[PDB]
């Protein structure tokens, strides 16, 4: 009975390191430095993978989320990537956006620049999903429960006015 739309053709469009799950699940999971991509998928996520860079890696994540309107949650889990600091950089990008040199405002990551996505693609990212901070948590029971919680709170597919 929840509202679902069809994702872009050949989704996920952009090559990367991830596991695709249910394309209609509302939840995406970035595992960061950790190797736990399976745990969110077996709790019924749409897509889960590591992300180790605070620029190109982040751009690939966003491009592959916005192309599926069913996704309304982005879990950030697993150990933080030392120096790159991808987790905290992404939180900052969601909340603050980018400055006019395309630097992510507030990000502690060493080279937090989004060179390749346009502005409209970020605004969409900020409106489409909400962020769920489980950074430096690898506990399975925890990650599973948060993913099932999001599924229970599925607002359905996104659509701009
Ligand atoms: C080249 C490189 C950087 C480069 C610059 C490149 C850059 N972009 O900033 C430089 C040399 C500057 C660098 C420096 C060091 N690095 Co470095 N670096 C790398 C390397 C090779 C990057 C990997 C890469 O280019 N990946 C391409 C992108 C696309 O990969 P990705 O970020 O993971 O993105 C993935 C996701 O987007 C996913 N994906 C795609 N779509 C979707 C959708 C969804 C929903 C999801 C979930 C996922 C997903 O697919 C992508 C993979 O193809 C890695 C090695 C590695 N094992 O990955 C180390 C790595 C990131 N280095 C890291 C470290 C430690 C550093 C340093 C901090 C080390 C030091 N003390 O000097 C520094 C300094 C940081 C800094 N920037 O100043 C470590 C992290 C260790 C840790 N876990 O704590 C790594 C893993 C190497 C290692 N094993 O030691 N680094």
Numbering used by the authors: 1 to 161
Please, what does the article write about this entry?
In the methanogenic pathway from H2 and CO2, the membrane-spanning methyl-tetrahydromethanopterin (CH3-H4MPT):coenzyme M (CoM-SH) methyltransferase complex (MtrA–H) catalyses the exergonic methyl transfer from CH3-H4MPT to CoM-SH (ΔG°′ = −30 kJ/mol) coupled with endergonic sodium-ion gradient formation. The only prosthetic group required for catalysis is vitamin B12 (cobalamin) bound to MtrA. Here, we report on the X-ray structures of the B12-binding domain of membrane-associated MtrA from Methanocaldococcus jannaschii and of the MtrA homologue from M. fervidus in complex with cobalamin. Analyses of these structures reveal a cobalamin-binding site that differs from other B12-binding proteins in an unexpected manner and also provides initial hints of how the energy of cobalt demethylation is transformed into conformational energy used for the ultimate sodium-ion translocation process.
Genome analysis has revealed an extra copy or copies of the mtrA gene in many methanogenic archaea (e.g., M. marburgensis, Methanobacterium formicicum, Methanobrevibacter ruminantium, Methanothermus fervidus and Methanosarcina barkeri). These cytoplasmic MtrA homologues consist only of a soluble cobalamin-binding domain of 170–180 amino acids, which is in contrast to the approximately 250 amino acids of membrane-associated MtrA. Crystal structures of two MtrA variants revealed a detailed view of a novel binding site for cobalamin inside a Rossmann-type domain compared with all other Rossmann-type B12 enzymes studied so far. The structure of cytoplasmic MtrA complexed with cobalamin and the structure of the soluble domain of MtrA without cobalamin were essentially identical. This finding suggested that the MtrA structures observed in this work were relaxed forms. The possible repellent effect of cob(I)alamin towards the histidine residue probably causes a conformational change in the MtrA protein structure 11329. From there, the conformational changes could be transmitted further for sodium-ion transport across the cytoplasmic membrane.
